[PDB]
Amino acid sequence: GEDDAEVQQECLHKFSTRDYIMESIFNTLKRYFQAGGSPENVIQLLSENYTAVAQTVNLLAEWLIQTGVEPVQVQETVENHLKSLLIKHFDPRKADSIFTEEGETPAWLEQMIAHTTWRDLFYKLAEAHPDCLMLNFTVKLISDAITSVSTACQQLEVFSRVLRTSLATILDGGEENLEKNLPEFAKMVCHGEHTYLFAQAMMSVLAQEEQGGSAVRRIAQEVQRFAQEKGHDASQITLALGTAASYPRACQALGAMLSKGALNPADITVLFKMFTSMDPPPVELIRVPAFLDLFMQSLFKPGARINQDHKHKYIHILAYAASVVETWKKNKRVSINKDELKSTSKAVETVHNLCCNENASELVAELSTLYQCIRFPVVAMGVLKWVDWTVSEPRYFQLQPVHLALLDEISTCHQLLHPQVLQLLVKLFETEHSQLDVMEQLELKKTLLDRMVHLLSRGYVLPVVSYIRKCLEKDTDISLIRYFVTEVLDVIAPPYTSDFVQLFLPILENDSIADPVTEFIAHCKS
Amino acid sequence: LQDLGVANGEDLKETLTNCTEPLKAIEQFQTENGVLLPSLQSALPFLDLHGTPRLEFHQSVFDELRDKLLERVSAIASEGKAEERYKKLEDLLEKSFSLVKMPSLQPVVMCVMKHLPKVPEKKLKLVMADKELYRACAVEVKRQIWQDNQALFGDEVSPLLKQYILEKESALFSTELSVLHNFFSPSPKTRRQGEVVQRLTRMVGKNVKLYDMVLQFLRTLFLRTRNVHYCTLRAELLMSLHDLDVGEICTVDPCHKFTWCLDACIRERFVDS
């Protein structure tokens, strides 16, 4: 039958309800006027319940602006309200319907994207929807202005172009901006094993270049680390890519160890017999970062399972990894130095014995041999992981901290361990205990600040002051920054290069005392 | 709306009546009475497409922005330099009293009148004249009319005093006898808990002129009735002012200390040493 008796009431519900005149009112009005009936009382029903909420808002908003309160507060409040209503009431089906009625969204979308909050709205909408056509199109086009990983790896050509551009940005990033340039690429590579294998092979071929391919090899190892973080075993990838195929025993042994993410006396025994033979396989073959991290966590956490007949075998293989010089005569190992092996293995043995014994005062007893033996780099790393796991225990500072002293030997005597030590202390500078009060937390923080200022004195100055600026802008109270400046200007000698001033002085604007601060500011601005 | 130069519904129907292009006139009226930000004039069709009318986000921001306006009325009462803050509140009063007739800006203006010690009395006169304003008006608005003229004070204390005598007569004539309790068991502070004298204290607040007014009106009825009820109500009003720790009456009244002593006397029902 005719739908007038029902559809006219459907439209009259939206007419005679409180306050609907300002809308789909045109569509329902057209349906009613084509359906006939009483169109004159429809307009009266629309305007009867017109409460004039809009002019009420005019009065209220212009009165808040009269009050001298910032109108940008009103802008933020309205934007937050409407954006939250959208997110709560967003329908992906209706987004795909907007795509269906026309492929490119009309100018309302291109007007919203000018607003940063709406761009973030589209980001949160589309980062979770890898099949909604409007959302996928918006995220991809905004990337053309996150590139969604599903449309990143949907084909070779898109993945390759975004890969090479992102890798260009990583290489442009030097040694700092990679933290932002690598994940967008790495998570793009870490979605499937075929995009993964293609990427790892391209970086392997690129790494053969002696004009910086070492950095491409570094980035490939980092991507493999991330692929492990996504729970995917790239052991056989590194095997068949590297020189594992040259030695099947080392291949299966190392590959099993990497696939588990743990060691074992069996594969270790295989490598021990190989490097005990007159033809030791390449030392580059075992020199893998995660593998050597397995050595650290076997030899320097409490435990693990260990036999004395294999303890020395683990130690000797790590010494071979850290010591032996193989000279390539066109990729031919012809000279094998093993003369700095026994001392390294002895130091590793003694330091590992101290570390698994769960040492404090006994550390100070044998600190002489320790600072004698931290000169070995691998030993310095082993002690670093040991003191990290001991000190990372919750409330390890209420009971002896001598451990923080040892970094002074490490970072001072090994330049390339500056990034680790600060990247250790960044956790320790965020220590918080309810037992050790905020006073003791601030003492420990100031001690760590003295350590970080010493590490700055060794040349690691850009990331130190950058992180100090960041956590002041966040966490770190003004007292800690003032103590930082006190110790710094008490220790650092002029001249002060502008690369250090550019971050140290515009954060020192908050304070003016520790007077050495006045001298520093006057010298560095003049 | 015309008080500050804005149109009303009759002007809208004039804009529609006898027009060859009523639709464009309606659109022009909508443009003239919209919220004036540049982002909205494009977003209004888009948000209208959802099935959400423009009035709905207007309602949300209406609640939010009048809440902040009331917050800022209280702030400017308590914030800013004195001349500037009172100038701001009086100017906002002149803006807002045109819409006290509307259902939005009554209590905002009532707070503004609450936080000014004195006002041009035309608006206080309208507050008493109109029953809706006579209800919703804040306490100090009523105090200002009473402090400026005693008509409303007498008009409202007469029924309250009639109710007090109603309570006295009804309680004194009640037909219960027991070893358990009688009607003289409550102490005077027990009897002050009734809303009659407490609301009378609210009506007086901390003002001495209204104290003199209640004193005189109780004096007149005590002189005509020969009844101790109005005496008791003066005592209750004084000690309810003391219950609020009203220093404006308690420290200046020589009777306050003595009635406070009499309160303990009545509580024990003896005058101990």
From Swiss-Prot, chain A:
<dbReference type="GO" id="GO:0005654">
    <property type="term" value="C:nucleoplasm"/>
</dbReference>
<comment type="function">
    <text>Essential component of the NELF complex, a complex that negatively regulates the elongation of transcription by RNA polymerase II. The NELF complex, which acts via an association with the DSIF complex and causes transcriptional pausing, is counteracted by the P-TEFb kinase complex.</text>
</comment>
<dbReference type="GO" id="GO:0032021">
    <property type="term" value="C:NELF complex"/>
</dbReference>
<dbReference type="InterPro" id="IPR006942">
    <property type="entry name" value="TH1"/>
</dbReference>
<comment type="function">
    <text>(Microbial infection) The NELF complex is involved in HIV-1 latency possibly involving recruitment of PCF11 to paused RNA polymerase II.</text>
</comment>
<keyword id="KW-0539">Nucleus</keyword>
<keyword id="KW-0694">RNA-binding</keyword>
<dbReference type="Pfam" id="PF04858">
    <property type="entry name" value="TH1"/>
</dbReference>
<dbReference type="GO" id="GO:0005634">
    <property type="term" value="C:nucleus"/>
</dbReference>
<dbReference type="GO" id="GO:0003723">
    <property type="term" value="F:RNA binding"/>
</dbReference>
<protein>
    <recommendedName>
        <fullName>Negative elongation factor C/D</fullName>
    </recommendedName>
</protein>
<keyword id="KW-0804">Transcription</keyword>
<keyword id="KW-0678">Repressor</keyword>
<dbReference type="GO" id="GO:0016020">
    <property type="term" value="C:membrane"/>
</dbReference>
<comment type="subunit">
    <text>The NELF complex is composed of NELFA, NELFB, NELFCD (isoform NELF-C or isoform NELF-D) and NELFE; NELFA and NELFCD form a stable subcomplex that binds primarily through NELFCD to the N-terminus of NELFB. Binds RNA which may help to stabilize the NELF complex on nucleic acid. In vitro, the NELFA:NELFCD subcomplex binds to ssDNA and ssRNA in a sequence- and structure-dependent manner. Interacts with ARAF. Interacts with PCF11. Interacts with KAT8.</text>
</comment>
<keyword id="KW-0805">Transcription regulation</keyword>
<comment type="similarity">
    <text>Belongs to the NELF-D family.</text>
</comment>
<dbReference type="GO" id="GO:0034244">
    <property type="term" value="P:negative regulation of transcription elongation by RNA polymerase II"/>
</dbReference>
UniProtKB/Swiss-Prot annotation, chain B:
<comment type="function">
    <text>(Microbial infection) The NELF complex is involved in HIV-1 latency possibly involving recruitment of PCF11 to paused RNA polymerase II. In vitro, binds weakly to the HIV-1 TAR RNA which is located in the long terminal repeat (LTR) of HIV-1.</text>
</comment>
<comment type="similarity">
    <text>Belongs to the NELF-B family.</text>
</comment>
<comment type="function">
    <text>Essential component of the NELF complex, a complex that negatively regulates the elongation of transcription by RNA polymerase II. The NELF complex, which acts via an association with the DSIF complex and causes transcriptional pausing, is counteracted by the P-TEFb kinase complex. May be able to induce chromatin unfolding. Essential for early embryogenesis; plays an important role in maintaining the undifferentiated state of embryonic stem cells (ESCs) by preventing unscheduled expression of developmental genes.</text>
</comment>
<protein>
    <recommendedName>
        <fullName>Negative elongation factor B</fullName>
    </recommendedName>
</protein>
<comment type="subunit">
    <text>The NELF complex is composed of NELFA, NELFB, NELFCD (isoform NELF-C or isoform NELF-D) and NELFE; the N-terminus of NELFB binds to the NELFA:NELFCD subcomplex. Binds RNA which may help to stabilize the NELF complex on nucleic acid. Interacts with the first BRCT repeat of BRCA1. Interacts with KIAA1191. Interacts with NELFE.</text>
</comment>
